[PDB]
Write a protein that binds this ligand. Structure first.
Ligand SMILES: Nc1ncnc2c1ncn2[C@@H]1O[C@H](COP(=O)(O)OP(=O)(O)O)[C@@H](O)[C@H]1O
Ligand SMILES: [Mg+2]
Length: 430
RNA sequence: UGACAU
């Protein structure tokens, strides 16, 4: 049964703009990161939000958001997108990739307006934004409303675990910007509720994830859909912190004469995260987690685990200890997942146990410690995980449990990530 | 394994 109607998004102005992490002590160190731009005829980067040829109201929304100065990815992607070019954007976690695409797209939607089309119940969005998880899609949706606040733009969302008709009937009214998880998006496409015949911008957030074996078929069904306008007559944008060369190659099928902007080393960890490791047997992990939480009372802690099974187990373990713990993973009801995330953000619960479902994109204020109870199999997922802390120039801590019986294969990539980020390398990862 | 329509 899927009947959950999520609460309606706040139309409280202050609350819409307060959905942000305030910049931290090292925000100005973003100026010291080497920017590599490759591709034909890159337009010059902009120097400030004031000198970015943005519309008065769009600029005023950026300033309402709290932002005073663009990050490196924004300095580059903004003029690139407004020139009409395709873009692969790589930049570390917590450095403002979302606004890098929202702000200019919102600008061009307003500056170069087209009348909406919704014909025969079938909406034709001018922007499709896809992301690999439901809570990230909702987050992106709320950021789009922030930067498009007070304008005539209509943003809609589409993701699973919600009542299909609630989202469907809303989309049917028409929307400029549709933000979606792929499953629910294709559902509406195959029902003739959404069509790609008016698309001006496609955006893959976490694009390296979207292009891997798990999502590539769903990406093809969008990019190559019969209703989709061809690559030469629309813009495609792809952002991530991580981007293996083999995945970069696959991206080029959907890109037209594109610019590749990489801020710092591709796939590098944020240097604002202190990365610590504890060597432990599979048995010892439980005791070591308890110990780490005991040594950190009053801190907001995000605990990553491999299985949904272990997520449920760890939440139970910590809860029976009398610690207020939320859990988020794919076997939980959608309502519960959104409530766990909200309880964790609000501070009601200081501990959140998560599978990889929360590894990418989520922007949670004041995560003090990210704990990898289980390390992931991919270094790129590790980079994203620890990036849940240390954002926008604030400093954070990651503590990862290393078990050689499980994680030996990761050691060479960990060590490289550590050295790139100026982190000490324990003897057991050498 | 883990995300991703019902
Ligand atoms: N130019 C800026 N100045 C201050 N804060 C910003 C700026 N750009 C983005 N932010 C904030 O930084 C946080 C991280 O943004 P996000 O787009 O999630 O980063 P990324 O996608 O690179 O991980 C968000 O809370 C966002 O509101
Ligand atoms: Mg992001």
């Amino acid at each position: 049964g899927v009947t959950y109607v999520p609460p309606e998004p706040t139309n409280d102005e202050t609350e819409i703009f307060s959905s942000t992490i305030s910049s931290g002590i090292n925000f100005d160190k973003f100026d010291h990161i080497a920017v590599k731009v490759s591709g034909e005829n890159p337009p010059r980067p902009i120097e400030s939000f004031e000198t970015a040829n943005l519309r008065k109201y769009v600029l005023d929304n950026v300033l309402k958001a709290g932002y005073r100065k663009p990050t490196p990815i924004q300095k580059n992607a903004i003029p690139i997108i407004m020139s009409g070019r395709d873009l692969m954007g790589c930049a570390q976690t917590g450095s403002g990739k979302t606004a890098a695409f929202l702000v200019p797209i919102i600008n061009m939607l307003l500056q170069d307006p087209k009348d909406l089309i919704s014909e025969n119940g079938c909406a034709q969005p001018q922007v499709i934004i896809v992301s690999p998880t439901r809570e990230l899609t909702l987050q992106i949706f709320n950021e789009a409303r922030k930067f498009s606040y007070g304008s005539v733009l209509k943003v809609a969302v589409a993701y699973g675990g919600t009542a299909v008709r609630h989202q469907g009937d809303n989309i049917a009214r028409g929307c400029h910007i549709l933000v979606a998880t792929p499953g629910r998006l294709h559902d509406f496409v195959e029902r003739n509720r959404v069509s790609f015949g008016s698309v001006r911008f496609v955006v893959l957030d976490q694009a390296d994830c979207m292009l891997d074996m798990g999502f590539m078929p769903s990406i093809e069904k969008m990019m190559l859909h019969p209703t989709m306008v061809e690559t030469t007559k629309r813009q495609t944008l792809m952002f991530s912190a991580t981007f293996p060369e083999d995945i970069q190659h696959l991206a080029g099928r959907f890109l037209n004469n594109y610019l590749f902007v990489a801020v710092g080393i591709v796939g590098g960890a944020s240097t604002d995260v202190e990365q610590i490791f504890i060597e432990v047997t599979k048995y010892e992990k439980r005791n070591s987690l308890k110990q780490l939480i005991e040594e950190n009372d009053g801190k907001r802690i995000l605990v990553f685990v491999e299985t949904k099974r272990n997520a449920d187990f760890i939440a139970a373990m910590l809860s029976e200890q009398q610690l207020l713990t939320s859990s988020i993973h794919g076997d939980r009801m959608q309502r519960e997942r959104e409530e766990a995330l909200q309880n964790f953000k609000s501070g009601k619960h200081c501990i959140l146990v998560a599978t990889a479902v929360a590894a990418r994109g989520l922007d949670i204020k004041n995560v003090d410690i990210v704990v990898n109870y289980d390390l992931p199999k991919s270094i790129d997922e590790y980079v994203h995980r620890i990036g849940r802390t240390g954002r926008v120039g604030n400093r954070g801590k990651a503590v990862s449990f290393y078990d050689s019986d499980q994680d030996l294969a990761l050691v060479a990539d960990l060590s490289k990530i550590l050295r790139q980020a100026d982190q000490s390398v324990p003897d057991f990862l050498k």
